[PDB]
């Protein structure tokens, strides 16, 4: 075992020794390769506890945190070697963190656990005016406003008025490492001398940082691995995720805003360690809190008198007219954007009209008459992925910005009130929204390559042309042939730098041109819109809480609508020619096969057909090339049954062979779509 123990000390020295080259991508690839050679033996992997006892975790953490190379370079260098062993290297880190985990479930002192009975567990509180005394069995959720109508001090510590009874006493007892069972035992005595929202249960603890002990190196390695862009195969820590689920399972501590700092810091800083539903529940518990959290736990319990007396959420009627639906909804959304109450929309009952409203306005925000999002630039609604367009520094951009703020407030009000939207936001929109609201990170990534791949998810043609420019930034004659000026592509009315409308583009100032274009598409060009969106969103609850999600995962929570795949709509939006007829038997069979599919089948087939995970807003009818089935003729002297359908989609074409039977055709389709993954 000496060869598997002492050599790790030498590797640690190599990582710590600055004599090792760590500047270029090749050197980092080399050190990643030697690390993989050391960590993975010919018999079995390095066990979790062995990894941190030799300091290897810190040895590589310092080199990945104290090197002066771009994050893109490091991510590429790592994934060039570890792409085939992501879980083989994730198991080691997860085991090490499991061993070194020491975070504590800050519970209310057991008392049957966080079960059904843990709801109305009351506590004894003896108020004494220190400047007069009453003893009242006080509910653990009542705040110093909802109970004590005069500042408060417990253990000679100032107490915020908006906090609850528990929120101060519990923290007082925890911070001095007092017993976790005396809380129900001690009669804690306090010394003292528009619908408001009790969402202040994290606003004062946003920077509640707590050290992770020896696990800091492991956490840093996990964060870097996740930021390398690999899948979510094994980033979930079963021990930590279960502990967090247990902590959220206790309702009394959460309803008082007394969450442990480790939970908040880990969720905000490392969101890849927990399952999606756990993080969504954490957001539900921390964001809107008391009024909705009482009913959220009541719903779980029903599958009580105190909850039903202290968690009644009233509803406010919203009546709008179908003619001015968009504008009236937007103005009412501004007026009651952050009102804690539940808002139902009525057309001039129940979930029907309000769902219709949340759907139609989500459709409207996607049109071209508002000049909000970038368009195809060649049917008011936009089809492709929806993303903001650069503003005009001179033109009156007041209405665009106001509408963007309305969009932010609308999205937040929808997400809080568990509604379903229809947007098709680009994930890059939310990626930049995150990088903007995250401290000490530039909204535009410093590295160029990341920006190019970030616009490649927005306008693929724009990105490929810009990459052509970049790859040909050292052939001046090519730039002269391009013959373009320092103005944003797609709108000549805006220049990159002032006075550049006549500025030729050549090898001398190519980099300035690229930086200007990038800042005009992703950064300064859309900075006002993004900031207005964040302000509107945070008018209800802070956008910081949404950092626990991921860019790719909160696109879906907004793009959640039950699409229509009925037979009638499919028939009215299907084309069959060049061999097929509309009332053909095989066409009817194909429609019957398609329209009975499940959830994942639809998405897989749509990705196979068009390349998008789901069809644009409005159903199949919005597919402008008007999806068409063409009879794939049988040639080459062999039967059509063995032939596998080929896409060859120019616009919306699907080469469907004239199969001798329906079930063979379905088998071929199910075969082809899976290899279309």
């Amino acid at each position: 075992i000496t060869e598997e123990l002492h050599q790790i000390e030498g590797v640690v020295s190599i990582l710590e020794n600055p004599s090792t080259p760590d500047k270029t991508e090749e050197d980092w690839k080399g050190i990643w390769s030697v690390l993989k050679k050391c960590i993975f033996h010919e018999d079995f992997d390095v066990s979790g506890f062995e990894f941190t006892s030799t300091g290897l975790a810190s040895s590589i953490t310092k080199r990945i945190t104290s090197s002066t190379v771009s994050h893109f370079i490091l991510a590429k260098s790592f994934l060039e070697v570890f792409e085939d062993c992501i879980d083989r290297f994730l198991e080691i880190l997860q085991s090490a963190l499991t061993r070194l985990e020491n975070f504590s479930i800050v519970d209310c002192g057991l008392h049957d656990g966080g079960g059904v009975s843990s709801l109305a567990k009351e506590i004894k509180i003896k108020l004494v005016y220190d400047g007069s005394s009453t003893i009242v069995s006080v509910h653990c959720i009542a705040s110093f406003t909802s109970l004590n109508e005069f500042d408060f001090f417990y253990d000679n510590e100032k107490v915020d008025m908006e906090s609850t009874v528990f929120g101060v006493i519990f923290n007082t007892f925890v911070r001095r490492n007092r017993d976790l069972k005396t809380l129900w035992d001690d009669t804690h005595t306090i010394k003292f001398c528009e619908g408001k929202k009790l969402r202040d249960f994290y606003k004062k603890r946003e920077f509640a940082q707590v050290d992770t002990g020896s696990s800091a190196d492991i956490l840093t390695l996990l964060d870097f691995l996740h930021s390398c862009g690999v899948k979510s195969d094994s980033f979930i820590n079963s021990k930590l995720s279960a502990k967090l689920a247990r902590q959220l399972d206790e309702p009394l501590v959460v309803a008082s805003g007394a969450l442990p700092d480790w939970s908040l810091f880990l969720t905000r800083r490392f969101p890849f360690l927990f399952p999606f539903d756990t993080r969504m529940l954490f957001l539900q518990c921390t964001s809107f809190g008391y009024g909705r959290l009482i009913q959220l736990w009541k719903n779980k319990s029903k599958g009580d008198e105190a909850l039903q007396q202290l968690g009644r959420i009233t509803r406010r009627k919203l009546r709008i007219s179908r003619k001015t639906i968009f504008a009236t909804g937007l103005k009412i959304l501004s007026k009651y954007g952050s009102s804690p109450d539940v808002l139902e929309i009525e057309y001039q009952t129940g979930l029907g009209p309000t769902l219709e409203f949340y759907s139609v306005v989500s459709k409207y925000f996607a049109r071209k008459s508002l000049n909000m999002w970038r368009c195809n630039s060649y049917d008011d609604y936009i089809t492709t992925l929806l993303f903001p367009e650069p503003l005009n520094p001179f033109s009156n951009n007041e209405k665009v910005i106001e509408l963007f703020g309305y969009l932010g407030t609308f999205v937040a009000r929808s997400l809080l009130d568990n509604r379903i939207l229809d947007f098709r936001f680009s994930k890059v929109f939310f990626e930049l929204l995150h990088r903007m609201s995250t401290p000490n990170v530039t909204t535009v990534p410093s590295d160029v390559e990341t920006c190019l791949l970030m616009i490649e998810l927005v306008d693929p043609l724009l990105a490929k042309s810009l990459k052509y420019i970049v790859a040909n930034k050292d052939d001046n004659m090519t730039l002269e042939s391009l013959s373009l000026t320092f103005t944003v592509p797609g709108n000549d009315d805006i220049e990159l730098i002032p006075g550049g409308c006549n500025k030729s583009l050549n090898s001398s100032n190519v980099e300035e041109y690229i930086h200007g274009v990038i800042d005009q598409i992703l950064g300064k060009g859309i900075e006002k819109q993004l900031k207005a969106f964040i302000e509107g969103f945070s008018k209800v609850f802070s956008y910081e809480r949404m950092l626990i999600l991921f860019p790719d995962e909160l696109v879906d929570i907004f793009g959640r609508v039950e699409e229509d795949w009925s037979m009638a709509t499919l028939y009215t939006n299907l084309n069959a020619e060049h061999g097929y007829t509309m009332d053909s038997s095989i066409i009817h069979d194909f429609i019957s096969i398609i329209s009975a599919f499940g959830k994942h089948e639809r998405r897989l087939f749509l990705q196979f057909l068009t390349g998008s995970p789901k069809l644009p807003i409005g159903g199949f009818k919005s597919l402008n090339p008007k999806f068409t089935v063409v009879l794939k003729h049988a040639e080459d002297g062999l039967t059509a049954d063995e032939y596998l359908p080929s896409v060859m989609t120019c616009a919306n074409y699907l080469k469907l062979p004239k199969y001798t039977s329906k079930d063979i055709m379905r088998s071929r389709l199910c075969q082809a779509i899976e290899e279309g993954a």
């Binding site: 042309s465 420019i469 042939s481 000026t485 003729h633 120019c650």
Partner: protein, 146 residues
Amino acid sequence: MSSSKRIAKELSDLERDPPTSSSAGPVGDDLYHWQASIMGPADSPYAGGVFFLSIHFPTDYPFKPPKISFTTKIYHPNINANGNICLDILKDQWSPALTLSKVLLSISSLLTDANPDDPLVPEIAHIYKRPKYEATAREWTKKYAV
């Protein structure tokens, strides 16, 4: 030297160096919409035909490819009735270094050697894959291209 000046420079290139057979130009005072008059090769089955194309440049003319549409109806496996052309250049091989004087030449070569492997109208590809030449070109060329 902007996108509008990119179109202007293309126009100057066409003016000072006219193509041998496949002439083209803008339409009216507007710079975006154009007109192209390409002629099928004499040795080609489409010989002796004048064809009109409606060219519509995008907003970012040098970056995204232009829209080329046939107005003179022709019979070809790779050309549809609305004038849409399925060619690699206009979709994926597109570079801002590709001038219109190159895309029209690409169409000129396409009208000689078709693209049966990637057809737009399948039955003509089925026919192509000797009297197919005549029954594909000659009558349409005589009644439309002349």
